[PDB]
Every structure is written in structure tokens, then in C-alpha cells.
Amino acid sequence: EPSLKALASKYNCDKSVCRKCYARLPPRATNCRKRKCGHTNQLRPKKKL
Amino acid sequence: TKFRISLGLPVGAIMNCADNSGARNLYIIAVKGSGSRLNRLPAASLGDMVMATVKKGKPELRKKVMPAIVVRQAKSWRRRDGVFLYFEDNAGVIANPKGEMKGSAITGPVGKECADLWPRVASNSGVVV
Amino acid sequence: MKYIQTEQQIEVPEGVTVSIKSRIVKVVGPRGTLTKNLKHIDVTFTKVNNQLIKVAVHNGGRKHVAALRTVKSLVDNMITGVTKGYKYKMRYVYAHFPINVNIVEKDGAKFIEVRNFLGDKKIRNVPVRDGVTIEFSTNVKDEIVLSGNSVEDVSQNAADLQQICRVRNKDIRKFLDGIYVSHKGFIT
RNA sequence: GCAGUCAAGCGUUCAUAGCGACAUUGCUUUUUGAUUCUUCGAUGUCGGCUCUUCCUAUCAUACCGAAGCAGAAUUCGGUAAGCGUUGGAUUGUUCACCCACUAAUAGGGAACGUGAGCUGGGUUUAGACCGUCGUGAGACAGGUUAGUUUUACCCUACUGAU
RNA sequence: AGAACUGGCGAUGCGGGAUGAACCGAACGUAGAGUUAAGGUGCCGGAAUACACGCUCAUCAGACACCACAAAAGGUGUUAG
């Protein structure tokens, strides 16, 4: 199901990961929303399967 | 599962060997599925799998650790039908960790609780209580 | 930097009536009525005519001014809710176990039930909030449609249905099973 | 002893899933030193046994994030000390090392908790033996064996009772 | 741990630093009145919940020398440049 698989992908796969606290973030974010890491700008994309 | 049976065989107890594997007695060193408490000795009852070493028997059976299953208990215990019963002595058989007997015959009666838990013990037993 | 004055404009269509007093906002439209309490922003509402309403902040900082635009958005959503409505569409996604979704009535509470999610024996029940109507669209396979006048009520109710179908103790990249929102729009 | 920053590299490709050189900033007082302030008209000294409470730098259990997470297993990280963290062989041992069970057998403090609570195996009086050293009396943080553990009725604390 | 110059404690109370041999102010017969020092004026507590321009919101804010601690490295938090 190419159409439905893409729909589920944007919620489970198309994400960004904070380098310091592993938080799940929107794909286009520039800073983490967590206070534990002090809103750091060190972010990476979530690894693909 | 097994309903609770009064424990009568703490670690260090020596019980007779009831099967024909060649061993004459079993020296209990541990009990499977036992809890933890300071200074409390692990103890076994009818139907429990234990770890034992053969003290008297064939030389190839001695000086190593093997699982065993208790089939008779000299300590009185109460069944849910209300009767208190006990056997003349303590006895066990050598088995693998999966529960299959090393020997192929059992001498003497076997408790009903042990027979239900272990199908292999039931097949090799003659009289159940 | 304590800006002297900032303003935003709210457009009122022909068929909508808005009554605001003491930061209590009520809108009346063809589809129904909505209300909202806004006694936490400290703004000023003024009426220009029957078709335009202005909301202002006097001597406000960066943080206070940012909330002025939020108030405009909330009132605008109320207005378009009672004249056009909101419609959220969700799709069932599964690999092996079909997902069975039905509407049940437990002691007059109007729940929605989810069955056979990843082969689970557990029964998942989600309450349906007041003002939200649920219908299973035809000629589309595995789709559920939520409609209402309040965008927050519809969006939160759909969010509860999505969160209740989260996979645990599995790689969620591989196990893409759940119910996800697929379209956000208007009833009309 | 524990935790950061930088990122040359490792990771088939790819600095930062997980690691990480050359450097550099800290924290801790459960290591050992440095010092000699308090006590020589004396604060009973190693370990174990017993018992309570506290700390979190979390071994297990609850809920989660991340992966070079298909599943199973495992690894890294977050909130968390609520609740548990054992039975034995050798050794006086703390330590250490094995056997076994277990969801797990995590690390520490409390005058290196706790001797008018015990015990006295060790160390550390007087007896005695050996080895090396010394002409000798004798010495040895070298080995060995035998060696008295006192008092609460007072105040407070605590447990119960008028 | 050991030297140099000066001022101190020891030999010294009094006001202040909550508390302290050494810091700050000031050194002392017995009393009255007035004015001050250092330090303070929401309440404990004698004395403006005084005036003026800004800054800061911390799910471990901050709060006054000696003094009873915090760093490198970071933040599209907010402010000015």
C-alpha cells in the first residue's frame, strides 16, 4: 500500500532526533523543545529502516 | 502449577534414589524457583525440581551436578481435601532440565502431585499413592 | 521593546453574529453557536461595524504581542466553524490483522470501539466528545470521518483515536499499524 | 573514583547508533597521601553477627525515548530510591575467587554506624618454638601455638502503662 | 610550611557583619541632651510597603565585602549593541 505506507511514515519515520536527549522532533526543526538539553541546535534526522 | 506443599528437604538433605539410573542417593544443593531471604535455607517438597549430586553410586554418576525430581516426602503435608499424609522416606529420580528421566523405572509409590506435574515420571511409575 | 500599539482585524461574514463582553466571546452562525473564555490574555476588543472587529494591545512586549495574533486566530476559527464546519478524515493502516472499528453505546456515553489491532485481545474504547459526529464514509475502504463545529473538539477527538493505537515493544518503523489523520478540511 | 567540551579517526560506505586519539574544563570524599587544629589526670581498636534509617552515580521491577531496533535477544539514554537485592566451599579477614539459585543478586553514608549489644578468630602485654640477623643481652610492619572482655537503680531518648 | 613592611589580636570591651579572638566603624571615669560612623529602614526590628529609569519569570530564580564555592562549552528565552 504505497499511499497508506507514506501516510504512516510521516508520523513514525519523518522525524528529527536531538543529539543530546534523543527527543523526537519535527523534520524541519532547528532547536530541540526540551529544557534538559537547553534547547540545543544539534539535531539529526531519524534513521531510515 | 502445584498447590503449596510443606517443605521438608532443605539444602544438604540426602534422599534415596528411586529409579534404576545406577545412583543410590541424592545430595540436594539447590531448589529451582526458590525465593531469597537472609539466612533462610532453600527447601524442596514433593514435585519440585532440584539440583543434586550423587554421593554413592556408579563412578560415572558422581562428582557432577544434575537435576532431580522429588517423588516421596517424609514430612507431612495437607491436601486440599483435608487429609494430612506422609511417606516412609524421601526419594527422588534423576532427570534432565527439560524433565525427562535418566532411567526407565521407578521403585516404590509416587506422590500424586509429582505425577501430575511431570508426564515422564507418571509413565515410569507403577503405583500413584 | 514595549511597542506602543498593535492591532489585528477580524472579518465577520453576513450570517454570523459575534457578542463579546468581559473577554467572553459568543458566535452565532447557521451551523450553531460557540463560546470561549479569554480572561487570560489582557486584550481590548473594539467594533468598527457589523463586518469588522479589531483587537488591540497597548504597551506590550514581545511575548504579549505574540498572543495578540493567537487571539485573532482562535476567534477566526470559531467564526468559520459555525459557517462552514470542520471535517477530519482518518485511514486505517494495517499489514496482516484487519482493524475493526465500530460505534457502541455504553450506558448512554457513545463510545467508539477498536477491535483486532495487531491481533490484540484487548478492547480499546475512545469516548466521543459532545458536538462531534462520526460516520464511516462509503466508496472508500477503511476510512472514518469526524465532523463538528469546534476545531479543537474535532482535532482532539481524532488525536485520541490515533494515540490509542500506538505500537509497543516493537520497531515502529517496520510495524506501521495504526489509525492516522489523512485530511483536514471543511464540511462545506 | 565519576562526569563534560572539541572531533583527527573507528564503524563495508557515513565524525557523533554505539565508540573516539591529540588536548582541555570540572565534580566527588566510600582510595591513598599531604598537614598536625582538637583529644595522652584515656572518646575502648580489625572483621563478623544483629538492627534501623538515609544518599543515587539505577542491578531488578513500572512507564518511556534512541539504534547499524525484522522477530527473539541486547545496547545507549530519561522520569524515578516506591519496592527488593540471596544460599554456600576456602580465608580472622575488609578484599578476592569459584559453586548454585534468582526478576536481580547495584554502589555507598550514618564518630571508616553499631563491644555497659554479643563474639574474640586477627592485630597489640607477660609463656614457648623456628628461620634470618647480632660476640651478647636481644631484634624482625616474618611464620607458629597458649593467653580474665567489668558497672546502669540516675538524666534524656525510645517502647509500653497510670 | 617559611620570610619582608605596616596595622591588629593576644592584653579589648562597645555599634555593625544572624552567629565568630583578628574584618568594618570606633577604642571605654559616672550621668543628661544633641549629632553621627559602619550598617540599615515589608514583618520579626528602632527607621520611607519612599521617589526615578531600566533588566529578570527559573518543574532546584535571586538577594551585599572578608564569607562559608562553581568552570569550560551551549540556548530563534529575552534585552541592548
Ligand SMILES: [Cl-]
Ligand atoms: Cl643483638
Ligand SMILES: [Mg+2]
Ligand atoms: Mg603550625
Ligand SMILES: [Mg+2]
Ligand atoms: Mg577526663
Ligand SMILES: [Mg+2]
Ligand atoms: Mg571512658
Ligand SMILES: [Mg+2]
Ligand atoms: Mg564513649
Ligand SMILES: [Mg+2]
Ligand atoms: Mg567504627
Ligand SMILES: [Mg+2]
Ligand atoms: Mg565490652
Ligand SMILES: [Mg+2]
Ligand atoms: Mg556502644
Ligand SMILES: [Mg+2]
Ligand atoms: Mg585470639
Ligand SMILES: [Mg+2]
Ligand atoms: Mg607474647
Ligand SMILES: [Mg+2]
Ligand atoms: Mg599568653
Ligand SMILES: [Mg+2]
Ligand atoms: Mg554572616
Ligand SMILES: [Mg+2]
Ligand atoms: Mg518599625
Ligand SMILES: [Zn+2]
Ligand atoms: Zn533535546
